[PDB]
Every structure is written in C-alpha cells, then in structure tokens.
Design a protein around this nucleic acid. Structure first.
Lengths: 189, 108, 117, 100
RNA sequence: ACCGUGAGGGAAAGGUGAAAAGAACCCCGGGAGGGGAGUGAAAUAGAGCCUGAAACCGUGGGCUUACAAGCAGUCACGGCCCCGCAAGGGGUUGUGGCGUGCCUAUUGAAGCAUGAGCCGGCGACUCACGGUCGUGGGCGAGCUUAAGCCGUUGAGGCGGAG
RNA sequence: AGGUGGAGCCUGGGAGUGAGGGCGCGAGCGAUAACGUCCGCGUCCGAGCGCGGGAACAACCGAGACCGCCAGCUAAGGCCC
RNA sequence: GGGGGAUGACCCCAGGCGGUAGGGGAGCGUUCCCGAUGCCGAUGAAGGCCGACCCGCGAGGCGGCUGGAGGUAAGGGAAGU
C-alpha cells in the first residue's frame, strides 16, 4: 500500500503483502538477540595464577586447617572462563523471518533509484531539507547493490545494500530509507 | 580561650590520662605546680602542653591568669606495634600506644 | 562481573543496628548478638503481641475487685447477677468506672446485687 | 460530655474527643458523616441507667478521617530458623463523639 | 624486602591540589609538635596530606545508679528531659508482669556438645559439549555444519556431505 | 447405598530422608528388671505441633498459632494467700 | 473453587493458612549491555552522615548535614550478586 515514491511530488509504489502482515514481537526481539549474540566478545581470569602456584596446605593437628581457591586474589571459583562459548547461531529461517515481520514493523520510506547518483554529502543537507523531522532523526542510509556514496558519510552514517542490511540493521527503534535495488533485499524477502 | 596539644606523643595514653584527670579543670598557675611538683612522667610533658597553651592565648588568643583549663583530654592512636620474643616460635609484640594530648586554657 | 557487594551489606547492618535502640551495654552496636539479641527481642514482642490484651483481661480484673467487693461481694456473684442482665452486658469500662464515676458504678452495683438476690 | 456505648467492639468511654475507631468500610466513606451507635452505658452528668435501659436511644459521630496505622512493628522471630517482618495495620477512620 | 644451606618460597605499599602557590615571619618549646599571619573556592584539602564508615580509646551534657538478677528483654504504669512533621511523640528508665542466648550435627539441646573474642572487605550449585523433560515461538518434512564471499557501524547473505 | 463435600486415578518432570525415639495396648526376649531393646495397632515429636496445664518439664489432659494490646463465652485445669 | 469481572476492582462463603529437608508460584535491591522516535548534575554525580511519609516485605521516596566529581536508565537483556 502507501508505497510512497521519493522525488515526493513524483509517484507512489504499492505495499507488498510481505511487509504488510501483522507482527511477531516474540520473534521480534529474538531476531534481535541472535544479534548482539554472535556479535559480542569474551573473557576470564588466570588459569596459571587461579591454580598457578605450588601449595603446602598445612599438616594439621597444630592450629590450622587444610594451590586452590578461598584465601585471596587467587583461585577464582568459576570466573570468566574465556573458554566461554559465546556464539549463539540463531537460525536461518529464524533470522530472515525476523528482519521480515521486523521490517513490517518499519512500514508503520522509499528511495528513488534516481538518487543512486547524487555526489556530495552537502547534497544530503539537501534531499534533506526535502523531508526532515525527528524520524529522519533515526535514519538510516542504504542504496541498492552499491551504497549511496558520500551519502554514506555525515552525522548518521550507515549504508546497507539492497542486499545486506537487516534488523541489527535498522530494525532498532529507528527510521530510514532504501534505494529500490534496496527493496532488492525484499526479494531477499 | 585557647588550647594546647600534640600527637605522635610517645607514652602511656593511660598514664598520661591520670596526669590531667588531676590538674584537670582548674586554675592555671595553680596546677602549674601540680605537674611542677607532682610525680609520674607525663607530667613533664603535660606541663609543656600547658605553656604553649597559656602562651598561644595571651599571645594570639588573649586576660592572663584568670585562666585555667575548662577541659583537658588525651587520645591514643597511632600505636607502635612492637615485636618481642617469638613465642620462642611465634611473635609477640606489644604497642607503646602513641599518645595525643589536647587541653583547654580559657579565662575565668 | 565484579560483585563488590560493598556499600550494600554494611547498610543492611546499619539496618538492624537501628532495630538497635540502645538496649544493654554492648549489643548497643553489637553488629551481632546485635543482630541476634534481635530475633530474640522480636518474637518476644510478638508473644507480647498477643500477650498484653491478657495482662489486661486481668488488670481490670483487680481494679475491678477493688470495687466488686468494695460494696460487698465477688466476681462470681456480680457476674452471675450481671448476666441475669438482658439488654445490658459489659465488663471492660465497667471497672475504669466504679473508679471514674462512683455514682454511676455504685449504681449498677445495685440493679446488680439485686438481679441476684 | 462523657458517655460509653459500644461498637462492633467496646472501644468506648467517650463523648466528644473523637476516638480512633475500628474499621467499618461501608458506612464510613462518609467523610464528616453522621451515624447511630447503640448505647448501653448511660453515664451523663452524674446520672446513670441500664445499658439495657439505653438499648433504645443512643448517639452519633461524624465520620472524620481514615487514621493510617499508627506505626507498630512485629519482628516475627525464633531461634528455630524462622524469621520475618510485618508492620502495623489497625487504623481506622476517626470520628468525633456526637453525644445525645 | 623476608624465612630457606639448597632446590624453592615470595610480600605488602597507588590516589593533596587547578597548579604548589608546599607554608617566609612572629609565638611556647630541647626538638617534634602545637598558636597566629599568608596562599586559598575549602586546609576538620595540609604533606603518607581525596572519599576518609565500623570496631575501639577519649572530652562535656541529659537521664540513671548502693536491701539489687540477667545477655535479653518485651507488655503496663509512673517521674525527669526535648517538642523543625506541637494537646502527639522523642530519650532514659522505678516498679512490676510474663521470658533459657545463636549457629552446625542431632531420638532429643539452654546448653556443660561443637562453631565463633570484636569490627570491616574476600569467600562457595557455575561454564562447555552432549542428552533430558517443560515451556516461547518459526515452517510440518522440519533444521544447520565447516567454508566461500560481504564487511567506521564493520550488514549478513549464499554454503545442502550430514 | 451414601448423607459427604473434598479426597481419588493415570501419564509425566523435580525430590528427600534408606539409621528415631517417646506412650497406651497386644505379643517376644529379659530377673514380666531399666529412661533396655524387638515386632506389631493408634497417637505422639518432628529444631517448633510454637500456646494452656501438670510448679519448673518436647513431650502425658485440652489445643490447631494469617493479623487486630487496654471486648464476650468456655476447655482441660482451678478459684484461704 | 466458584457466582459477573471493564483493565482495575467489588460482593458472598466455602475454605484453610504453624512448618526444617524438600516440591511448585511471586517479588527485592547488587555491578554491567541497551540509550526498544530514553539523557539528570556545581543552586552536587556518588558514597557517606541522620529521620515520627511509601510497602506484608527484601526496598523505596524525600528532606537536613558531608564531598568532589559523575552517570542515571521509564525496559528488556546479562551475570564473578
């Protein structure tokens, strides 16, 4: 539906059943999730130290009791185990799915191919004053196959491609635009 | 009114304590003979912390004599953790419980 | 993943402490038996919580006698006569009366004695 | 000015000094309201009569406020590994002793 | 540094300030250290000198103490003392009234069974690969290895042995 | 049959103790001796089946502890102090 | 559990509610990663010091004094709690 065409005074495109649809928060986040995930890092606390030194835990029958943990700086107890499998491979289907319905959420904004041409990050200050606001606030670049040159740089960068530009992408709250070839990712859809 | 003092004071906080607990709240000049002719150490000391006391005042805190010690006290701190005979094996240290020494000198 | 619990525990304690009036020499600040002594005091209060209302059931008990007898008789008499009552039955306040308003008390005292014999 | 009726509980010995009164969330709501309170303790100006003589007339007092639990704590504890804590309840809405 | 002949063990201890402008001079004093002046936004920021809590030692004040028992104490009633949430509460208790601490292991515990002198901080059901039920949800044939490519942010997307 | 009323049955995940005593009774042993032990029928306690009583006393008689200090009837047990 | 719940909630009565291993449900603060069309503070971050409003609660808020610079997340996520 209200597939608004850029250039504004120019044409209007149709809404693809796809996007249309309802919503699926659950998956929603999920998509999310299986994001940061496969995308964090890792850490831990000494293997040597935390089980590093010799140790004469002391005889006994003397006034004491006993190279392990529970007397200082040393030991750990179950710490950063770098050996901390961090990944989280969501699932294909899963994923894709998300972005989708995801985007669907986006709809709730049409980048005329013709733009795949403009040649200065001050021509953005332009096609800007075209239609600004707060949602632009969000914004969210993206051409269709080979990014929106210079369009890529400014105080809101980010240039997905009609392929490659998912939820991690904008999914977040956010608001943006896609060069047809963009909706070339819809096909991906 | 004014006051005298001094920390890092090597001595039996306690002992000290008796010190004033005497000459305590009383006429200057007066006790000024208590510690002059009393006994146990501290005195000496104690005395001292009365002169830069009587002084400080008149000098920069001002009416002589008519003065005395509205109040006087001592505190311990800093210790002197001291090592002694290894339980003939393990250490046994005492502590010359450093010693603070404040004391008032206000005018009648 | 540091846990410097810190600042926190300390607090708690303060907590209790408060729970910590100035009771007995020590506990006073006894960050233990401090705490303890508590538990104790508590439950105590409790049982006291329901207690009292008793200590009363009796209190009036005497201040009551003080009179119930005064005139000339006990609380197994009165009582009996009292319940001979019909549109009037109470006990608590009764006392704190016999003493507050002599006449008043004095009264019933009669209507009573009678009801009885 | 000093009477002694009795409500869903004696709670009596009054006249005008509004007496913190047991709940009653059905007639109360009535802010500064008026309502009847059976007697049975006629003590006025040094003259008395059966609390059964009474049980005929009575009084009334204006539904004043809604005292909010006057603090009171209940350390529920025991050496027997059982603790816990709940604060006061009993309020009540206040109301003056409308005597008659 | 330190105990060990040796092989070896193996600590503690960081933080003034915007910068020293780091305290000339005068005072009691053998000095250290304390009294003034001066820097200064503040030095109860002052030289191991940011925050600087508790335990623990002091100095004054309120109340309280000499025919009196229990850690405790908490319920009642009373007098002194203060009412920046006033006709209600603060604090302290004189009496009386009912009261065996606290943890582990125990048939059973006040304990005379053990655990702990006091305070502060560390300190104990975790992660991975499997499998196992339950549940949140994507398609019913469902689902992905490893890798190839794409990668301020770095954007996932193809890979079909299993 | 069922007055009841709220236990019952199967499938399935998660368990704990795997050694207790005390009392009445019916038996075993035992000097019909033990706060002895050994099996049974009910209860009892479970570190709270916390409160009442029997002075004090888990525990034996009564009792089932959501909470309400200045209510009311009783239980068992009591009422010269 | 059940009689209608508009999202609350409200009404009846049935109906208990003492509980350690141990089983099920619900909540609280601790340091971090979001800043799901989120940013406060030199007329104080925060910790500290003290309190007769908010909650069954574990905590909250809020006001007075301290102290030199931070970090808070209305919501979901994580864990050396």
């Amino acid at each position: 539906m209200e597939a608004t065409i850029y250039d504004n005074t120019d044409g209007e495109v149709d809404l693809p059943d796809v996007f249309e649809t309802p919503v699926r928060s659950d998956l929603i986040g999920k998509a999310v999730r299986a994001a940061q995930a496969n995308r964090k890092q890792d850490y831990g606390s000494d293997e040597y130290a935390g089980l590093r030194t010799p140790a004469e835990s002391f005889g006994s029958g003397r006034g004491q009791a006993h190279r392990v943990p529970q007397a200082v700086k040393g030991r750990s107890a179950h710490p950063p185990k770098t050996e901390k499998d961090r990944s989280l491979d969501l699932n294909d289907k899963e994923r894709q799915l998300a972005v989708r319905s995801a985007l669907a959420a986006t709809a709730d904004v049409v980048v005329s191919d013709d733009f795949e041409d403009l040649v200065k990050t001050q021509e953005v200050v332009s096609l800007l004053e075209a239609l600004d606001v707060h949602a632009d606030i969000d914004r969210l670049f993206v051409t269709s196959d080979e990014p929106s040159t210079a369009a890529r740089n400014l105080a809101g960068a980010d240039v997905a491609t009609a392929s490659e530009v998912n939820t991690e992408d904008l999914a977040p709250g956010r608001l943006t635009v896609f060069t047809e070839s963009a909706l070339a990712e819809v096909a991906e859809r | 009114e004014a006051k005298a003092i001094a920390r890092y004071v090597r001595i039996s906080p306690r002992k000290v304590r008796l010190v004033v607990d005497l000459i305590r709240g009383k006429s200057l000049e007066e006790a000024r003979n208590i510690l002059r002719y009393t006994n146990k150490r501290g005195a000496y000391f104690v005395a001292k912390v009365l002169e830069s006391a009587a002084a400080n005042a008149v000098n920069n805190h001002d009416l002589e004599d008519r003065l005395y010690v509205k109040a006087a006290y001592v505190d311990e701190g800093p210790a002197l953790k001291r090592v002694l005979p290894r339980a003939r094996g393990r250490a046994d240290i005492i502590k010359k419980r450093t010693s603070h020494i404040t004391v008032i000198l206000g005018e009648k | 993943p540091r846990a410097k619990t810190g600042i926190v525990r300390r607090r708690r304690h303060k907590k209790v402490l408060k729970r910590a009036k100035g009771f007995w020499g020590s506990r006073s600040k006894q960050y233990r038996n401090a705490f303890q002594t508590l538990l104790n005091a508590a439950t105590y209060e409790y049982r006291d919580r329901r207690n009292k209302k008793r200590d009363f059931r009796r209190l009036w008990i005497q201040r009551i006698n003080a009179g119930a007898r005064l005139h000339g008789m006990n609380y197994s008499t009165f009582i009996n006569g009292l319940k001979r009552a019909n549109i009037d039955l109470n006990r608590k306040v009764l006392a704190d009366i016999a003493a507050r308003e002599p006449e008043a008390f004095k009264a019933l005292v009669d209507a009573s004695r009678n009801a009885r014999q | 000015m000093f009477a002694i009726i009795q409500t869903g509980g004696k709670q009596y010995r009054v006249s005008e000094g509004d007496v913190i009164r047991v709940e009653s969330l059905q007639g109360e709501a009535g802010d500064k309201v008026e309502l009847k309170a059976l007697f049975v303790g006629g003590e006025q100006t040094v003259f008395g009569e059966d609390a059964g003589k009474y049980t005929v007339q009575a009084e009334v007092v204006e539904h004043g406020r809604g005292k909010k639990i006057y603090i009171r704590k209940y350390k529920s504890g025991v050496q027997y590994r059982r603790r816990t804590g709940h604060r006061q309840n009993f309020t009540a809405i206040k109301i003056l002793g409308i005597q008659g």
